[PDB]
Design a protein around this ligand. Sequence first.
Ligand SMILES: NC(=O)c1ccc[n+]([C@@H]2O[C@H](COP(=O)([O-])OP(=O)(O)OC[C@H]3O[C@@H](n4cnc5c(N)ncnc54)[C@H](O)[C@@H]3O)[C@@H](O)[C@H]2O)c1
Ligand SMILES: NC(=O)c1ccc[n+]([C@@H]2O[C@H](COP(=O)([O-])OP(=O)(O)OC[C@H]3O[C@@H](n4cnc5c(N)ncnc54)[C@H](O)[C@@H]3O)[C@@H](O)[C@H]2O)c1
Lengths: 230, 230
Amino acid sequence: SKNILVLGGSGALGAEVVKFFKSKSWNTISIDFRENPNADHSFTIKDSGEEEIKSVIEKINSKSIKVDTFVCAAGGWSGGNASSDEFLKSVKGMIDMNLYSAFASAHIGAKLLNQGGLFVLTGASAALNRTSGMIAYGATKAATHHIIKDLASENGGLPAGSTSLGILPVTLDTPTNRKYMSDANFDDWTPLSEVAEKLFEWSTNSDSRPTNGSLVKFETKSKVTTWTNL
Amino acid sequence: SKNILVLGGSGALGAEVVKFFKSKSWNTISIDFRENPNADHSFTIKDSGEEEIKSVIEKINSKSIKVDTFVCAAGGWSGGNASSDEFLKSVKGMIDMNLYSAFASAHIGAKLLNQGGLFVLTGASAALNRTSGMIAYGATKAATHHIIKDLASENGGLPAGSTSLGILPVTLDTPTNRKYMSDANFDDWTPLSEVAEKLFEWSTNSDSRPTNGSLVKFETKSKVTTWTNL
Ligand SMILES: NC(=O)c1ccc[n+]([C@@H]2O[C@H](COP(=O)([O-])OP(=O)(O)OC[C@H]3O[C@@H](n4cnc5c(N)ncnc54)[C@H](O)[C@@H]3O)[C@@H](O)[C@H]2O)c1
Ligand SMILES: NC(=O)c1ccc[n+]([C@@H]2O[C@H](COP(=O)([O-])OP(=O)(O)OC[C@H]3O[C@@H](n4cnc5c(N)ncnc54)[C@H](O)[C@@H]3O)[C@@H](O)[C@H]2O)c1
């Protein structure tokens, strides 16, 4: 009876990953700033700080469960180049939403994940190139990609045989995106269930995994999604 | 009169940059947690947060100065992999010391840099590769490197004709390194005054500047220092 943990499990991608692993009879666990009442186990943190992270790790070590797959689907987006009015505020918000969660993920993986397990961070494809219109987002995502790679090392702190991977979306199909970019071709965005699907593939079948430390970019074009190992 | 502004202006490197510029008759300005009385103007910030950064820019601005060279020499080092006891602390330490200050520099440069100005962040050579034993330092430095590249773009927010560079030491000769690697051969460490001299050459001879956005690695071997643009 296999266990998955999802940091950001109340977000759009987060809850899809939960709905999906639950239909497939895995035990689902969720960590977020708000409850997700559709998970089998569901926790609230106040922030991504040391105190709150330790205190959530201890609550799961009390239920005596260890996870086979951990996905961080936590994050957020804000815009702005260095001279924009919103720049300084986008700094705090991207560090809190993207970086602290990525780092929290590492610790959580190091304490809760079983040998052989899957450890997945959500990066951003955009951050593989220049992000001069969204500096804080690009840089905090670039740090995400760096941590994913560090954790693929023997001595990185995850248990033996575990695979550390990055998933890197171009664009996701969320009600949010559909609201704030209503012009767009929705057929060029990734259904969330597709992401959950690939995540199940990797989680049930170890042979399907890409090499440890792979950043994996996915882009949807006319409803067809292509996954590329980078 | 030419102005240089230095974030981290009271640290070992930061204070050597001030001293050396002051000797070539530049006007020097220092922002740090404590004053640098050797500088011509010295400012204190209680933190690297939005409000503190707005104020010190607002202060320097209302004094009518713009700067020809900006250098961020702020930062810190802390160790630890993802499973180690000090890991969560090292996360918050490295975010506050390296990432918040690189982000603050972007803003300070966008607001105070003169057209044609030189803008330099301190990155890390080791963050070019895996930093498994020091994940928080490696990731915040990787983010620093990405900021440097975003600030090279004409859309990044720095003024027309400016040049954004990273200097990426293998090993500086600083009290920090003396403390942690006191067995080393010190002749394989870069003297801080050579860092200052290279900065000065780029500040006064715009032709000697590397490509906008280069991460410039430098390493000393038996007192011979080699600078490599990446
Ligand atoms: N949606 C897109 O088009 C797109 C594109 C590229 C990358 N991404 C990344 O996909 C991931 C999820 O996207 P989404 O569209 O589902 O986002 P969403 O905003 O719907 O969900 C994100 C969740 O993360 C939570 N969160 C924020 N900071 C946290 C922290 N520090 N610790 C724990 N939880 C935190 C939020 O509370 C929210 O519940 C994010 O990493 C996002 O950066 C999304
Ligand atoms: N030699 C190496 O191996 C190596 C490699 C790469 C980078 N570095 C970097 O060298 C740089 C300078 O080192 P040092 O020995 O002079 O260190 P130092 O500790 O003497 O000085 C750093 C200064 O930065 C200030 N500071 C810290 N965080 C700040 C912030 N958020 N905003 C403003 N000021 C802040 C501190 O108060 C201190 O005055 C740092 O950026 C460090 O990350 C060293």
